[PDB]
Amino acid sequence: KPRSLRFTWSMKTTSSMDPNDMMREIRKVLDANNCDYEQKERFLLFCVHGDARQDSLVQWEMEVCKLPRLSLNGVRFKRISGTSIAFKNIASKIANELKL
Ligand SMILES: [Cl-]
Ligand SMILES: [Cl-]
Structure with missing residues (x-):
């Protein structure tokens, strides 16, 4: 079950939406934006975007709760x-594109 959060x-x-359907949508939008994700738990992703050899590498958690x-x-x-800017840019793009 997803964690219950304040x-x-x-x-x-x-x-x-059903949390599993939410996860499907999240992975779809991440794929579309060339973000990798590690499946840390059923409802928790460790996401990565950009190029470590440039200034663009961003890592962040996404969790369905x-x-x-x-x-x-x-x-x-x-x-x-x-x-801060690289995170704001990619995370905002993902959030704006989620169809939940
Ligand atoms: Cl608050
Ligand atoms: Cl949040």
């Missing part, structure tokens, strides 16, 4: 590495 201002991606206090599911994003 709603915070960072949570901007919510959905009533339940938000019981909203009766919704959500997608958590958290930076792991990379410049």
Whole structure:
């Protein structure tokens, strides 16, 4: 089951979709944007975009979670590495393209 998490201002991606369907959509959008992901847990991805030999390498977590206090599911994003601008750019693009 996805983890149950407290709603915070960072949570901007919510959905009533089945969490497994959410994961399918997330991987689809990541593929479309040439982001790699490691399947850390059923509902947790370690994502990577860009080129380590340039200035563009960005790593971040994406997690599908339940938000019981909203009766919704959500997608958590958290930076792991990379410049602030590179993270803002790629993570915002992914978030904008998710069809949940
Ligand atoms: Cl908050
Ligand atoms: Cl979040």
